[PDB]
Amino acid sequence: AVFEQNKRPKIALVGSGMIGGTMAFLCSLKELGDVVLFDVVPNMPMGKAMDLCHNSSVVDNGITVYGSNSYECLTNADVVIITAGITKIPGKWSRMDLLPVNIKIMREVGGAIKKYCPNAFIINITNPLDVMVAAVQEAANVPKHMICGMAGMLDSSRLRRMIADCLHVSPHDVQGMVIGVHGDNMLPLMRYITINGIPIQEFINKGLINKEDINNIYNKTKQAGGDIVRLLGQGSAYYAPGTSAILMAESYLKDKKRLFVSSCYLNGQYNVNNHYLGVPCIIGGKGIEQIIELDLNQEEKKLLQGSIDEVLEMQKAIAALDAGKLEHHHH
């Protein structure tokens, strides 16, 4: 137990790499709560925590960030945000080349949650997002409404930024959603884009944006993650992903009831049967408080089935792995 007892929320970051550090920085700056940076790399999270305790002093608050290499640091966590995983193959892009490895990490993490903080609200980030969140849930056995995956907020923010830059309006007033799988089949819902509730079609008809811009933004949204990977040279995005996850955690901690496209457990909704998918939901002090079911048209249902199939395809790969079908002995 690292969290010294006090009034503040206790935020446990399982994974202290690029995104974990970003999120700890945000907690310090926002005075959101005390933080533990947990990692398997020895001492590295203690170095970042020390830097971030200094940062709190820079901005005149006493938020404490702890570093830990022990799962027992999860004791009394109110929120757990997971970025744990192996993210590069030794010797040398897809959100799936390391699934066999990271599925096992997700199950150690889930078991740690079950043991040390079974009542926490859990946000997963580790890719492939929609099946990794399920792996955590099964190992942790937390209620379905107390766990989700961060992806839609990030994908939606990229759609919204591009519309905003095109129209010269604040992103504050661009409503936009990307649903489905956090992957190649992600579905930017171009029909549901609004400018302060005004359908984007009205702006199309006025000549403020044209159908070519719309089509390019649809494509660029799906490509944004890979575009960032290519430019960075090493690793993937971490600023916008960390802030997206932290806003979701803040909505839970302060009962804001804000709406986030998040990977949620569905049984019935969206033609999804007992697995996760990026859909609009409401996050408040009771966890996932509402799942909103859009009135998608036939074309959109067709596109969304591409996302659902991508998730199902991944479930079967995981079934095969767990069943031992993909390996054999020397003999």
Ligand X SMILES: NC(=O)C1=CN([C@@H]2O[C@H](COP(=O)(O)OP(=O)(O)OC[C@H]3O[C@@H](n4cnc5c(N)ncnc54)[C@H](O)[C@@H]3O)[C@@H](O)[C@H]2O)C=CC1
Ligand Y SMILES: OC[C@H]1O[C@H](O)[C@H](O)[C@@H](O)[C@@H]1O
**What distance in Å separates the CA atoms of residue 170 and residue 167, rounded to the nearest whole number?**
9
Question: Pick from 56, 64, 68, 83: which binds ligand X (CB under 6 A)?
Answer: 83
Given CA atoms 142, 138, 95, 289 in this order, what sign does their dihedral have? Answer: negative
Confirm or reject binding of residue 307 to ligand X (CB under 6 A).
no
Q: Which residues are catalytic?
A: 182
Residue among 177 and 214 whose Cβ is closer to ligand Y: 214
Sketch the per residue contact string, 17 through 56, with a copy of itself: x for CB under 8 A, - otherwise: ----xx--xx-xx-----------x-xx-xxx-xxxxxxx
Exposure on the CB side of residue 108, measured as CA atoms within 13 A: 14
Work out the burial of residue 174: count CB atoms within 10 Å of its CB; fewer than 13 is exposed, 13-18 middle, 19 or more buried: buried
Question: Pick from 56, 64, 68, 126: which binds ligand X (CB under 6 A)?
Answer: 126
- Which helix (H) or strand (E) covers residue 166, if one does? helix 152-167
Residue among 63 and 277 whose Cβ is closer to a copy of itself: 63
Residue among 59 and 326 whose Cβ is closer to a copy of itself: 59
| Helix %, strand %, coil % of the chain (to 5) | 50, 20, 30
Sketch the per residue contact string, 61 through 80, with a copy of itself: x for CB under 8 A, - otherwise: xx----x-------------
Q: Which residues pair with 148 in a beta bridge?
A: 123
**What distance in Å separates the CA atoms of residue 177 and residue 194, rounded to the nearest whole number?**
10
Sketch the per residue contact string, 154 through 193, with ligand Y: x for CB under 6 A, - otherwise: ------------------------------------xx--
> Which positions touch ligand Y (CB under 6 A)?
190-191, 214-215, 218, 299
> Which positions touch ligand X (CB under 6 A)?
14-20, 38-41, 83-85, 87, 95, 105, 108-109, 125-127, 129, 150-151, 154, 182, 235-238, 241
